[PDB]
């Protein structure tokens, strides 16, 4: 699992918003700098900036 | 005016969510009542997330 190092507010409908310290499962990381991630807290899924998270 | 140095996601009803680079005017502790010039929303923000 990965952890958010910063808050992130969605800038498009298919982004995932998240808070610093949120645990995230990376669901796809093969399409570029934005990874598809799943929030273990909220259950939501969406794209996130890969540089805002780090392996937990 | 103040600028957001970081994104902030609201954690309470009266918090203000904002994005890095958003311009804010403080209206009035460590949490300040701020008005977003970009979105028009008003709520409390962590004072250490913004800069003049």
């Amino acid at each position: 699992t990965f952890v958010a190092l910063y808050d992130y507010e969605s800038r498009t409908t298919t982004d995932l918003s998240f808070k610093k310290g949120e645990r995230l499962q990376i669901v796809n990381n093969t399409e570029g700098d934005w990874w598809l991630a799943h929030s273990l807290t909220t259950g939501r899924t969406g794209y996130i900036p890969s540089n805002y998270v780090a392996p937990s | 005016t103040f600028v957001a140095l970081y994104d902030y996601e609201s954690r309470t009803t009266t918090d203000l969510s904002f994005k890095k680079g958003e311009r804010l005017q403080i209206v009035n502790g460590d949490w300040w009542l701020a008005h977003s010039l970009t979105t028009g929303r008003t709520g409390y923000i962590p004072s250490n997330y913004v800069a003049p």
Binding site: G32, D33, W34, S50, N51, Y52 | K20
Partner: peptide, 11 residues
């Protein structure tokens, strides 16, 4: 916070 990276390449 870090700069947001560029969005993903179109498929």
């Amino acid at each position: 916070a870090p700069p947001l990276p560029p969005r993903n390449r179109p498929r």
